[PDB]
Amino acid sequence: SRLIFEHQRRLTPPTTRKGTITIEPPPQLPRVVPPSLLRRVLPMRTEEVDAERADYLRYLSVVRDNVRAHAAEQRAALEWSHPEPEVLATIPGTRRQWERDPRDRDFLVLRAGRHDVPLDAALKVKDTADEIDLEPVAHSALRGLLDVQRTVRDAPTGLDVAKLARITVIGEADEARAAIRAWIAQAVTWHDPTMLGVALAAPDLESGDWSWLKWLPHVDVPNEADGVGPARYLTTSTAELRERLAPALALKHLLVVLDDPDADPDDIARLTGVTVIHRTTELPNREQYPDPERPILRVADGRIERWQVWQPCVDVADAMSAAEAAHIARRLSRW
Amino acid sequence: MRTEEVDAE
């Protein structure tokens, strides 16, 4: 029925030299004596301090170039490991499909869009002064540097799921199912179908809606045919999906999604990593400062605005379409 | 040492 895949090694994109770039503090406002016309009318004065200013600014330029190289490495890696939700149509073929392993820094991380990643490198200066006054035209430059070259511009974000255990989106219907299908495909595509599992419950499953999990062998079961479908956990009842997963519930990671806002949300959990996803109708208003785990997510036009006290947390969201996911499943069912 | 020096301190 299906072909065979062999565990060819993963390729390595050049990682980050995650060190501690250090910057020398500027000079210390050298005291300038009065010009004194008497000894200035013949035809440690400004010339020397200007020379020193120029030297420090040159040094600063060099450091800026180096940190930009580091930023280039970082964006290169992050683009390599979370491509845009169209290239993934071509990935199921080549030797990079199950290229994610539990030893690798990117594991069970699900891309959702592009915004400012804070440049994991250090950027620490060794300031040792007790409010001594530093030269104005150097300190100004260093300060104006340490704020714009510290955060990478729009970069592939990460909605990691290895330490969330619950995701609950809020907002319009299909805008939600978009980001959901998006990162759920991005998840299944990179990791061995023998390593992580997914579950579904929805009323109109086979209508161009959640049907598309048909050809999915990530939703599979061990030792069961179900006639045509791998496991076809794809259902409409909640506790029924639980029972279909009750033996599978026990590490193969589990990803249970629920297109139903009602029908007893939070009824399996609340375990040790098995993640639940549930689209909700409406929000809490005074949540007790939601834990970074099991958080709240609102879907704007192109934002995925987190819930904190609105901290958009994504400025351009990654959205998928239904038919695209359909063609994804179709292509991937081959190997 | 110029007067204008200490006056600056």
Please answer yes or no on whether B5 and A36 come within 8 Å at the CB atom: no
Our CA angle for A68, A79, A8, nearest 5°, is: 125
Nearest chain A residue to B4 by CA distance is: A34
Short-list A206, A156, A193, CA closest to A322: A206
Instruction: Give the angle A222-A325-A211 at the CA atoms, nearest 5°.
Output: 60
Within 8 A of B4 by CB-CB distance, chain A residues are: 33-34, 36
Name chain A contacts of B5, Cβ cutoff 8 Å: 33
In the block, tokens 């409010």 appear at A131
Residues of A with CB under 8 A from a CB of B: 31, 33-34, 36
Contact by Cβ (8 Å): A10, A99 = yes
Experimental determination technique: cryo-EM
Cβ contact A53:A134 at 8 Å: no
Question: H or E stretch including A167?
Answer: strand A166-170
Q: CA-CA distances (angstroms) from residue A99 to A108, A158, A178, A192?
A: 12, 17, 25, 8
Asked if residues A196 and A187 have their Cβ atoms less than 8 Å apart, the reply is yes
| DSSP annotation of A267 | -
CB contact at 8 A, A197 and A219: yes
Q: Which of A238, A30, A61 is nearest to A134 (CA)?
A: A30
Report the C-alpha gap between A224 and A3 in whole angstroms: 18
- According to DSSP, the residues that pair with A298 across neighbouring strands are A170, A305
According to DSSP, the residues that pair with A156 across neighbouring strands are: A114
**Do residues A270 and A168 touch, judged by C-beta distance below 8 A?**
no
Contacts of A34 in chain B (CB under 8 A): 2, 4, 8
In DSSP terms, A116 is beta-bridged to A154
Q: Which domain holds residue A298?
A: 107-119+151-335
